Ligand SMILES: [Ca+2]
Ligand SMILES: [Cl-]
Ligand SMILES: [Mn+2]
């Protein structure tokens with residue numbers, strides 16, 4: 001009983017514009033037809049404008065069904081699916097709540113591969129970025145088993161002010177980066193952005209009260225490159241927050257494979273209650289990468305938004321556990337959690353880094369494997385295994401309760417653990433060499449012996 005998009009005129013040849021047919025299918029499903037189920041037979045469905053998902057609709061695409069992004073409009077977004085209306089810039093409308101939407105199967109060709117000059121998207125010369133989904137003010141949205149290809153310096157998915165969103169068993173292949181782009185713009189392009197709902201981060205609607213995203217889970221998915229464009233810059237995260245935005249919360253990133261990202265597998269500021277668990281982060285050498293960042297990378301990077309005037313709600317309750325890191329690039333850091341500047345007024349707290357396995361065989365590593373900078377309270381770094389590199393764990397300028405218990409180190413060339421504090425002008429240890437533990441007793445710190453050493 002699922003309605004076929006062919007029932008409404010979709011040709012599926014990649015030449016005819018099938019947008020209207022697809023929209024009519026969705027609209028009918030939203031009314032109740034076919035139980036809200038829409039089906040996509042094998043084929044290539046070109047769309048020259050945005051398709052709008054509606055409440056209680058469920059799209060299923062054949063394995064050989066491909067949605068081709070043909071949205072090439074000046075001063076206009078090039079995102080295939082949205083959960084709210086959009087016409088032209090300057091005519092945005094408020095997006096009302098939507099819910100119970102599912103999308104499964106097939107491929108979405110965001111069509112962002114570069115022209116031979118590498119200055120623009122070859123098939124969409126007028127766009128500034130391309131993506132697949134713009135999910136805003138939505139509830140209970142499920143995206144699964146979808147292959148996303150060639151984003152033109154954009155977000156494959158944006159989840160803003162949305163609750164109960166699941167991205168599962170999908171593949172994010174390739175992100176095109178043109179010659180002309182600056183680093184500032186580049187690192188702000190996460191393939192899956194999870195953010196509060198503001199016009200700044202979600203210019204597709206008028207909603208501007210900073211509604212948070214909540215209960216978002218990205219799991220069992222693969223992130224890498226395609227045969228047309230290089231590795232993604234940042235797989236998941238966000239890069240913006242203000243006193244007026246509510247922090248996305250209960251964000252779970254589980255069992256994903258981040259295959260050689262250029263900057264980070266996970267990077268964010270302004271999240272609360274995050275769980276990054278059982279993921280695999282691989283990083284190859286510059287020579288085997290299409291995209292490479294000279295400035296370096298940090299596979300997991302929970303940082304603080306640059307702001308010295310406001311007391312922001314910086315990252316809190318972040319758990320980084322049981323992840324595996326295979327690093328070959330000497331400029332790549334495995335894990336980083338920080339309040340980047342002593343000038344930031346907010347606080348980073350309740351940080352847990354446990355049972356992670358770091359395999360660093362890069363030559364002459366240029367930085368620590370695990371960096372914890374200015375955590376204000378409740379920091380736990382325990383039972384992590386680090387194979388290779390220079391420094392193992394660096395804890396700098398952290399306050400409050402700190403617990404570092406039974407981590408393992410093998411074949412390291414530098415200090416296993418560095419517990420550092422600074423004064424208004426310089427640096428000195430809080431209290432050191434080899435493997436040991438740190439505990440907080442009555443507000444005070446103390447090194448404790450543990451007999452776990454490398455005998456390789
Ligand atoms: Ca969580
Ligand atoms: Cl939970
Ligand atoms: Mn339009």
Ligand SMILES: [Mn+2]
Pocket residue numbers: 158193195201202
């Ligand atoms: Mn956004």
Ligand SMILES: [Mn+2]
Pocket residue numbers: 200201202
């Ligand atoms: Mn944005």
Ligand SMILES: [Mn+2]
Pocket residue numbers: 114175176177228229230
């Ligand atoms: Mn490229």
